[PDB]
Amino acid sequence: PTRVYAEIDLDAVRANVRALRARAPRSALMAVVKSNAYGHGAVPCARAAQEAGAAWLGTATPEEALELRAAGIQGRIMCWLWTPGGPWREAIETDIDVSVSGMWALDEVRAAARAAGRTARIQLKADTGLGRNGCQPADWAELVGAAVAAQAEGTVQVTGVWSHFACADEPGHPSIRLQLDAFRDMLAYAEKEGVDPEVRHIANSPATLTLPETHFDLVRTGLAVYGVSPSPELGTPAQLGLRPAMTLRASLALVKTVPAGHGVSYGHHYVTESETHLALVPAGYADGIPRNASGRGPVLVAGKIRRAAGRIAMDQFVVDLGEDLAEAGDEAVILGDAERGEPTAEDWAQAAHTIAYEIVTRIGGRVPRVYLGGLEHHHH
Amino acid sequence: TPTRVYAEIDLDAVRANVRALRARAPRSALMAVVKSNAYGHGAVPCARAAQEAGAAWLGTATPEEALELRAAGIQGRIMCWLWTPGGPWREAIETDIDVSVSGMWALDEVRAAARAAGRTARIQLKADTGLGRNGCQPADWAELVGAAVAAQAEGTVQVTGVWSHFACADEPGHPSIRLQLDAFRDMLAYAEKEGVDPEVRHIANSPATLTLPETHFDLVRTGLAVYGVSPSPELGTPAQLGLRPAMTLRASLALVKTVPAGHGVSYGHHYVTESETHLALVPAGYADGIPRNASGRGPVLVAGKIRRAAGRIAMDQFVVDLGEDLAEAGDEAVILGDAERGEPTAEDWAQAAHTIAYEIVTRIGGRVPRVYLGGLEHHHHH
Ligand SMILES: Cc1ncc(COP(=O)(O)O)c(CN[C@@H]2CONC2=O)c1O
Numbered sequence: 192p193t194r195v196y197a198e199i200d201l202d203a204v205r206a207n208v209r210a211l212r213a214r215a216p217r218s219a220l221m222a223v224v225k226s227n228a229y230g231h232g233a234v235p236c237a238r239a240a241q242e243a244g245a246a247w248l249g250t251a252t253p254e255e256a257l258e259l260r261a262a263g264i265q266g267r268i269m270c271w272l273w274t275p276g277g278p279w280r281e282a283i284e285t286d287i288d289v290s291v292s293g294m295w296a297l298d299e300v301r302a303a304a305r306a307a308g309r310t311a312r313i314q315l316k317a318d319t320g321l322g323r324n325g326c327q328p329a330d331w332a333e334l335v336g337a338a339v340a341a342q343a344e345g346t347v348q349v350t351g352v353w354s355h356f357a358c359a360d361e362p363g364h365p366s367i368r369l370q371l372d373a374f375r376d377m378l379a380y381a382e383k384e385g386v387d388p389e390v391r392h393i394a395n396s397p398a399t400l401t402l403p404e405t406h407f408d409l410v411r412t413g414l415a416v417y418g419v420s421p422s423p424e425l426g427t428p429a430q431l432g433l434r435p436a437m438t439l440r441a442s443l444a445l446v447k448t449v450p451a452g453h454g455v456s457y458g459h460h461y462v463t464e465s466e467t468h469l470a471l472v473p474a475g476y477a478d479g480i481p482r483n484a485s486g487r488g489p490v491l492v493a494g495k496i497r498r499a500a501g502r503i504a505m506d507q508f509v510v511d512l513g514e515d516l517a518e519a520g521d522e523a524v525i526l527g528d529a530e531r532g533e534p535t536a537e538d539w540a541q542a543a544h545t546i547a548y549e550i551v552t553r554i555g556g557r558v559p560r561v562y563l564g565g566l567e568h569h570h571h
Numbered sequence: 572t573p574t575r576v577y578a579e580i581d582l583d584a585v586r587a588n589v590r591a592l593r594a595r596a597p598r599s600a601l602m603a604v605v606k607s608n609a610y611g612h613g614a615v616p617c618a619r620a621a622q623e624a625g626a627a628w629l630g631t632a633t634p635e636e637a638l639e640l641r642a643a644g645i646q647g648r649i650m651c652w653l654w655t656p657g658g659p660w661r662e663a664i665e666t667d668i669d670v671s672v673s674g675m676w677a678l679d680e681v682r683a684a685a686r687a688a689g690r691t692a693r694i695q696l697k698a699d700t701g702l703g704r705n706g707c708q709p710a711d712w713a714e715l716v717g718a719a720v721a722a723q724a725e726g727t728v729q730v731t732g733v734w735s736h737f738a739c740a741d742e743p744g745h746p747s748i749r750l751q752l753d754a755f756r757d758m759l760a761y762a763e764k765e766g767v768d769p770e771v772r773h774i775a776n777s778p779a780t781l782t783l784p785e786t787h788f789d790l791v792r793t794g795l796a797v798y799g800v801s802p803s804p805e806l807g808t809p810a811q812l813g814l815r816p817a818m819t820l821r822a823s824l825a826l827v828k829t830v831p832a833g834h835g836v837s838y839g840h841h842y843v844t845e846s847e848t849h850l851a852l853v854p855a856g857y858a859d860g861i862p863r864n865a866s867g868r869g870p871v872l873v874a875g876k877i878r879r880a881a882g883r884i885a886m887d888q889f890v891v892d893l894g895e896d897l898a899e900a901g902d903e904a905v906i907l908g909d910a911e912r913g914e915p916t917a918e919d920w921a922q923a924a925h926t927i928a929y930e931i932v933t934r935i936g937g938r939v940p941r942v943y944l945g946g947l948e949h950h951h952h953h
């Protein structure tokens with residue numbers, strides 16, 4: 192690549208899960224590789240993680256997990272975002288743990304297990320307060336009654352019971368101890384109606400890094416696997432011992448001199464104060480560069496951190512080097528490692544008024560990924 | 572048909588939009604701009620649709636997007652302008668692609684390339700008339716203009732056109748507009764006198780095309796308007812401008828349940844139910860292209876009524892408050908589509924997320940499948 196590409200370090204990835212493994216000594220690890228691994232490459236990161244000690248693999252959509260098996264990845268895998276008509280049968284045949292939050296899901300899977308002549312491994316999801324997916328406390332008895340019954344009929348096998356936190360990245364939030372308590376009480380009742388789960392889990396990356404009383408048998412870690420801290424309130428990847436996996440770089444396409452008082456970019460939302468040097472970065476919002484980052488986004492050009500000049504276009508944006516010099520083809524680092532003096536996904540989150548989760552995840556397809564580290568077959 | 576979420580592209584809306592646009596610049600050619608996967612609509616399918624409908628030129632930003640079009644079997648004139656040292660000059664020249672030169676480093680590369688390729692490269696000179704983005708500054712025109720006419724004589728290149736791009740065309744009656752138009756006539760002319768005979772002179776994008784007839788010249792570069800979306804509300808709705816929206820984003824509810832009064836919804840708990848009600852889970856989040864920034868305002872059409880994103884929008888989904896109404900898993904929700912059909916539109920979302928329509932349709936995820944209608948059967952094979 193010469194215009195813009197993403198450099199993924201697989202050694203950073205492996206070291207992260209080894210760090211996270213130590214953080215929860217008595218628990219099992221679940222590397223979440225959903226959404227193309229938050230933009231780093233689903234399969235490469237799935238193999239690296241697993242190699243480093245990942246016992247489970249989790250994704251959102253059935254398609255995402257199927258594609259994981261398609262690439263010959265063994266071990267326990269699980270998905271949780273189903274919609275009526277999903278590929279229940281296919282998932283069951285590949286021995287993937289599908290999740291259930293309602294009777295409709297349970298009924299769809301039970302019928303699929305029949306056609307497949309096999310038993311689906313299912314995990315019941317408790318809605319302990321997030322109010323997103325999962326079963327409400329008011330319908331827990333009912334759904335729990337059906338599982339054990341569908342279990343007796345040998346059609347399904349309840350392998351686990353799980354929930355998910357709403358403000359776990361906000362240390363001290365009252366909503367946290369609530370859900371955690373509601374989790375225990377819901378688990379008891381189900382464990383009493385004839386359910387012996389293979390795994391018990393509720394924690395995510397922030398919960399994992401903060402509350403041990405929430406580790407149980409398994410922990411589902413996503414973002415931290417990529418060396419990005421869930422929130423500033425928890426620390427920088429550096430303080431967390433996490434190492435950034437992606438480095439986004441580009442080459443300048445033009446460097447010119449313009450008189451003082453010259454407008455730059457759409458809407459001329461930036462006017463040159465004095466005759467200066469204007470560089471051109473060939474990466475716009477279609478490549479994943481937030482347009483709300485207009486005027487703030489940091490770029491590492493010529494030994495100094497520069498700022499987005501004016502509006503950010505679909506394909507490119509300009510930067511004012513001032514007195515400094517540079518030429519077409521030169522390297523620019525839009526986001527990378529804080530330990531290398533470069534900008535980070537957090538820096539851009541703040542610049543764009545969003546979160547580090549969005550920054551990395553929304554990095555386009557038009558942008559090639561280049562792998563380094565891990566083993567050779569990982570780079571596929 | 573997709574079970575989670577998907578996008579349907581109406582190829583007839585595309586075919587009709589260009590036929591409308593041409594009738595606006597009667598004495599100028601039309602270059603359809605399908606860069607960025609046709610602003611999220613599917614590059615090859617739309618490129619074919621627009622050609623057959625009347626586009627004489629195709630425009631993409633990068634050489635790769637241009638080499639993909641050729642690789643897909645598309646003929647006719649094509650041009651790309653975003654280049655960096657080491658680009659596929661040779662490959663681009665062999666495939667007969669009009670490229671843009673704004674600096675000398677480019678000229679020397681295409682020259683070395685036209686040499687290896689044993690062919691003459693058709694180049695177009697970009698002039699920076701105010702945008703301050705790309706193109707030659709007025710103070711380096713003669714230098715570039717000179718070296719060019721020199722490359723001509725050597726038989727390496729061939730200057731096929733002189734152009735430029737506006738900064739505030741989409742802002743009706745902006746001072747920058749006239750100022751930029753003026754520089755064009757002066758910079759262009761000089762190039763003529765010094766020898767250059769251009770095949771085409773262009774400067775108009777969608778807004779300028781729709782508003783200023785004196786910006787047409789030989790060619791006109793229209794991107795957004797071709798897909799039925801209007802550059803700016805300050806120009807009207809696709810309806811008034813006489814345009815038909817081409818994209819329709821639909822998803823299927825995954826869950827619908829009842830929750831007690833005072834329950835929190837999503838991360839941070841930014842939304843609390845004022846009473847006992849029905850909540851519905853839409854399985855699509857910011858990884859599919861839904862702006863997280865539209866959290867709490869993004870309009871969706873669910874069960875006969877427009878609902879607002881209840882709380883924080885997530886990576887893979889978000890919830891909507893059905894209130895008293897009822898619905899179920901599998902029922903379809905329309906995120907964005909045709910206002911004429913009483914559906915939320917790209918502008919609606921553009922406003923909700925505090926941005927411009929251009930970015931909404933352009934950033935629709937790749938995890939999101941595309942389904943084509945109308946047009947010619949063979950148009951949706953690649
Ligand atoms: C159920 C579940 N568990 C674990 C994770 C991993 O979380 P971290 O990345 O914070 O470690 C996620 C991802 N959460 C997102 C965020 O938005 N939509 C989701 O599915 C999740 O949804």
Ligand SMILES: Cc1ncc(COP(=O)(O)O)c(CN[C@@H]2CONC2=O)c1O
Binds near residue numbers: 504736778792796802
């Ligand atoms: C150089 C160039 N020509 C023509 C067009 C087509 O313009 P319309 O889409 O308005 O018809 C664009 C706009 N492309 C975008 C839009 O925003 N930033 C860009 O680079 C462009 O960049």
Ligand SMILES: [Cl-]
Binds near residue numbers: 674676
């Ligand atoms: Cl130069």
